[PDB]
């Protein structure tokens, strides 16, 4: 129940954070 939700910020958070930088 815990890392079922952590995939919400995991494989698509470099996608987003490499846009600003």
Do not use: W, Y
Not at 1 to 14: C, M, N, S, T
Request: aromatic share 10%; charged share 10%; net charge neutral.
């Amino acid at each position: 129940g815990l890392f079922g939700v952590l995939a919400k910020v995991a494989g698509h958070v470099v996608g987003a954070i490499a846009e600003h930088f």
